[PDB]
Design a protein around this ligand. Structure first.
Ligand code: J6D
Length: 559
């Protein structure tokens, strides 16, 4: 069927929008742009297409294996209170006279509304649950042609809290149980790099590829979503959870009406809703089922897979150049029949460093003893374009980028320097900041960055040097494109930021010493941070990182 039908009503904004920075620094005015609801119709057309799905014995066999693996899981309902605390503080307010603040504080109006939503899920398994469709306002660098806005489709806040009560515990247990080491979200960046190097090394002759599905959410069929429900139902669950999961599947996940911000009927969806709890989990499991079945259909030899939502990497035993091309073509044809055709056809790679996945590539630099250190990086154009917009306007993406890409030269020299300088000038350094990342929210105090970085990337993230020529060229090109200061200027700025941080003492001084050790002549010998050992970041290493309206925070476990 068609992924979407449209009434012709526009995708409308809820708040005023800006395509360009106001000329009210104004050095980036013509270097950056923001997507708005004005390009929503162009995106709507791109995400609307017919799906045909033909499954075979390879798909059937893999699905039977997943269902048996899911049978081992036991999951429980979350209490209303647990689901309320997982809700981010600025999650889109309900249409029923309450917002995330009232949800988190367990106010009478919010609680009573959520209880009647839950009761309604138990009593009615069919009435379509309305959704809102919105165009995202995201920043990119001017370069072919302006990117149209991405679209999000979500149910009301009351329904979102109910999804957590029914399925949150499943999202924390089911993906690892059915996918094992293939489940991408479980790894910190250092552990992902370790897994990739190990998978590459355990091949007699390694060949790898990334597989980019064209608009994965739209390729997800009604049958794929009802199959996801049957994988959920294979778990040992309380009866109440089974009823609510079935009702959420038929009333919301399989499809339903979409309304614009004005309350006008906008369209009808027959594919994945971008803004529901099960998007990240369902995409991960469904991508995994299709890809493993396609590996079997193609004759991919000894595959090792890594899956994060719709991002997929397959590392296997090379069968020779001609055979590898033939097997990848056969892999693409099988993925196409399963309703997952590619954007660009996959290419066999014989160097792990040449594979791009989740917009990232593995790069090499040297450590304190001149030993090789592998890390994930990416083109910094979009992170730097967003940092420029957010500095000119207010406050976010910079914190998410610092955390994910802490060992990169562009984070160390540019992002870290600029944002620690802004934090001190604002005198709002010792505050927890909330930042949005793929539909979920994280609360991090910047003063805790050294311990967080050590836990995620290791102590080598503060002592890496001799970055690659490709990496240095990519960073210098991005800064030039944006008309931003070159790398040579960031060292002098970092010395000042480091001095200011040290002069403040305490945690601020630890940030100065660890994060900016690269900027000084007389390097200190950085030792492991005892605080890093106590960190509890359990929720961070789950599908919750890829979406689902989840609030993640930094906890500290007792020894
Ligand atoms: C999204 C970027 N990253 C990633 C880079 C990656 O590179 C490959 C990859 C590259 C090359 C290759 F040959 C094979 C594979 C990935 C892959 O698995 N492809 C199948 C992959 C996944 C992520 C990722 C995705 C989603 C969440 C988090 C995530 O939660 N990140 C953290 C975080 N995010 C926010 C807030 C706080 N913490 C840091 C934990 C990571 S990265 C650099 O962060 O590891």
């Amino acid at each position: 069927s068609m992924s979407y039908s449209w009434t012709g009503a526009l995708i409308t904004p809820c708040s005023p929008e800006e395509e360009k920075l106001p000329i009210n620094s104004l050095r980036y005015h013509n270097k950056v742009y923001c997507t708005t609801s004005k390009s929503a119709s162009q995106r709507a057309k791109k995400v609307t297409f017919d799906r045909t799905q033909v499954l075979d014995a390879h798909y059937d066999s893999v699905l039977k294996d997943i269902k048996l693996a899911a049978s081992k899981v036991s999951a429980r309902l979350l209490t209303l209170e647990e689901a309320c605390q997982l809700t981010p503080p600025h999650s889109a307010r309900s249409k029923y006279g309450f917002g995330a603040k009232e949800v988190r504080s367990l106010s009478g109006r919010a609680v009573n509304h959520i209880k009647s939503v839950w009761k309604d899920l138990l009593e009615d398994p069919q009435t379509p649950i309305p959704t809102t469709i919105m165009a995202k306002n995201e920043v990119f660098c001017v370069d072919g042609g302006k990117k149209p806005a991405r679209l999000i489709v979500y149910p009301d806040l009351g329904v979102r809290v109910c999804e957590k009560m029914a399925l949150y515990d499943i999202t924390q247990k089911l993906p690892q149980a059915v996918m094992g080491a293939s489940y991408g979200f479980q790894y910190s960046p250092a552990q992902r790099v370790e897994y990739l190097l190990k998978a590459w090394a355990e091949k007699k002759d390694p060949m790898g590829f990334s597989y980019d599905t064209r608009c994965f959410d739209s390729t997800v069929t009604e049958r794929d979503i009802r199959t996801e429900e049957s994988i959920y139902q294979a778990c040992s669950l309380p009866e109440e959870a089974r009823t609510a999961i079935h009702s959420l599947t038929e009333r919301l996940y399989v499809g339903g009406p979409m309304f614009n911000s004005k309350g006008q009927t906008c369209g009808y969806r027959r594919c994945r809703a971008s803004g529901v709890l099960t998007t990240s989990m369902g995409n991960t499991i469904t991508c995994y089922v299709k890809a493993l079945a396609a590996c079997k259909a193609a004759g991919i030899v000894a595959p090792t897979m890594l899956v994060c939502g719709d991002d997929l990497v397959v590392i296997s035993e090379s069968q020779g150049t001609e055979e590898d091309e033939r097997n990848l073509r056969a892999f693409t044809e099988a993925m196409t029949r399963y309703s997952a055709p590619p954007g660009d056809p996959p290419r066999p790679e014989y160097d792990l460093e040449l594979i791009t996945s989740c917009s990232s590539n593995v790069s090499v630099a040297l450590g304190p003893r001149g030993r090789r250190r592998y890390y994930l990086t990416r083109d910094p154009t979009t992170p730097l374009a967003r940092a420029a917009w957010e500095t000119v306007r207010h406050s976010n993406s910079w914190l998410g980028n610092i955390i994910q890409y802490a060992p990169t030269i562009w984070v160390r020299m540019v992002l870290m320097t600029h944002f620690f300088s802004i934090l001190m000038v604002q005198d709002t350094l010792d505050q927890n900041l909330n930042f949005e990342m793929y539909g979920s929210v994280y609360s991090v105090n910047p003063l805790d960055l050294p311990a967080i970085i050590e836990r995620l990337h290791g102590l080598d993230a503060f002592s890496m040097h001799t970055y690659s020529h490709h990496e240095l060229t990519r960073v210098a090109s991005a800064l030039r494109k944006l008309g931003a200061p070159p790398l040579r200027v960031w060292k002098s700025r970092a010395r000042a930021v480091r001095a200011s941080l040290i002069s403040r003492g305490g945690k601020a001084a630890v940030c100065g010493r660890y994060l900016f050790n690269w900027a000084v002549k007389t390097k200190l010998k950085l030792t492991p941070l005892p605080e890093a050992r106590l960190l509890d970041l359990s929720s961070w290493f789950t599908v919750g990182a890829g979406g689902g309206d989840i609030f993640h925070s930094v906890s500290r476990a007792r020894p």
